[PDB]
Write a protein that binds this ligand. Structure first.
Ligand SMILES: NC[C@@H]1O[C@H](O[C@H]2[C@@H](O)[C@H](O[C@@H]3[C@@H](O)[C@H](N)C[C@H](N)[C@H]3O[C@H]3O[C@H](CN)[C@@H](O)[C@H](O)[C@H]3N)O[C@@H]2CO)[C@H](N)[C@@H](O)[C@@H]1O
Ligand SMILES: [Cl-]
Ligand SMILES: [Cl-]
Lengths: 265, 266
């Protein structure tokens, strides 16, 4: 018997989901198990628990981002510069890993999607426009990002069978932390500007590898170990619910205590 | 033991569609296997963008969506479990109802396109973009979803086309319209439950249709389509790595009706 809408609603409420919350979701649909009506019922149940006054956001990114063209043979790069489509928020695919639900969320009526291709977020609900508005192209996990706004509105992160290493918010903690050294990347990307394709250079902190000798799984495990968040089952999945403000504060201090620069310049 | 090629470009797919016979302003129903096409520069949406470029905004593109999660099987469930479905299963919502499982990557992509229209019959739902998308998807009756009041009937009436892009010929939905039209010695008629939205609220209705899960007699759609191709029906050509077929909807329907009636007809 597949998990029903009502069963999931009750499980979300038992974990601590409440009306009016703003929530970023990371999920593994396989971990939840069979749901009556399919994966979209997971989103419908969560939005039921949040009510229309709540907000639900997910990381989408862009599956087809051609940020690697400089590594291709020159003649192939030339083809990409002419023929690869730009990031179009209406149709750009979300990244493939752990994003079945993010792709579902893009067909919801009244969805909003932020403008930074690599860091794009999708959101539905009362504060969806606020969270996704004015997402800067450079430093997409920084001060002008949906993650900064999620912290400012005292939102939450919900892990629904998703590995703790995939918490996007921790890239915002990396941005904030005063660390000895952070790796900067600069990469090409085609976007739409006044309805025309334009290739631009995006600058950001590397989000593919850590800036020092840590992992997000290590940080999150330490947070849980000192009492951070709530834990419970939703369907077949192990779930965690974290306050965005407290987790960000914890992670910044965690990074600064281990990888800060005590030298003055 | 065969390697994947350099990704096909938008421009090279447009050229291949035009070489196959796609013309501006046509109305086309597409059956595709994205895997068969091979790597595309920009991903599967580029297949749709190239096809719409060949058709222009004056053309129309339609695909079969259905509803992957339709609970049309609940009458065969024990009573306690059936009651759970009746209370908890979501209704068909055309905005979010996912398309059927197989060969539907492009149908799911079409649903994120602006100005998409989806027809109202859950099990037989079609999605369309372009000039005649509203016309094709309008007023799709709940009963006999492949019949006189269907997008397939309208596709035939406006003299549209069927494009096969690496999909097996047996999956041509239009052949269920031929079954509807053909006078045959035996037909299975089914009634099944379905939850829909009626004034924003979930209501369970009973749908009546010809069975489309099994043939009505000793035939298969692969048989019909293979006989059609063998007698010169359609045009053929490569699109990316896929072998493609382009059929006139009216000619294929007429052929399939005559095929069924010659073997099982009056
Ligand atoms: N074979 C047993 C039967 O399978 C049914 O399920 C079937 C049904 O959901 C679904 O059938 C769907 C219909 O829906 C839909 N309205 C049109 C579509 N062309 C048709 O598709 C089917 O018929 C085509 C041609 N022929 C095949 O190419 C295709 O593989 C097959 N899925 O696929 C399943 C297999 O056809 C039912 N479980 C029950 O009627 C019975 O148990
Ligand atoms: Cl997933
Ligand atoms: Cl496919």
């Amino acid at each position: 018997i597949p998990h029903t809408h009502a069963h999931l609603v009750d499980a979300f409420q038992a974990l601590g989901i409440r009306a009016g919350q703003a929530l970023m979701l990371h999920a593994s649909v396989k971990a939840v198990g069979a749901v009556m009506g399919g994966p979209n019922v997971i989103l419908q149940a969560l939005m039921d628990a949040l009510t229309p006054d709540g907000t639900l956001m997910m990381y989408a990114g862009w599956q087809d981002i051609p940020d690697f063209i400089d590594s291709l043979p020159d003649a192939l790069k030339a083809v990409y510069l002419e023929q690869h489509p730009p990031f179009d928020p209406a149709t750009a695919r979300a990244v493939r890993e752990n994003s079945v639900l993010a792709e579902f969320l893009r067909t919801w009526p009244c969805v909003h999607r932020s403008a930074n291709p690599e860091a794009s977020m999708v959101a539905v609900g009362r504060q969806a426009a606020l969270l996704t508005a004015n997402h800067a192209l450079d430093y997409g996990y920084g001060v002008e990002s949906p993650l900064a706004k999620l912290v400012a509105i005292e939102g939450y992160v919900l892990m629904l069978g998703a590995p703790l290493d995939t918490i996007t918010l921790l890239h915002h903690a990396e941005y904030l932390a005063k660390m000895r050294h952070k790796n900067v990347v600069r990469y090409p990307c085609p976007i739409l500007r006044d309805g025309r394709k334009v290739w631009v250079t995006v600058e950001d902190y590397d989000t593919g590898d850590p800036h020092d000798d840590y992992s997000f799984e290590q940080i999150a495990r330490d947070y849980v170990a000192q009492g951070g968040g709530t834990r419970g089952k939703v369907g077949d999945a192990d779930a965690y619910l974290f306050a965005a403000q407290d987790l960000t504060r914890f992670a910044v201090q965690w990074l600064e205590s281990r990888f800060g620069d005590s030298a003055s310049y």
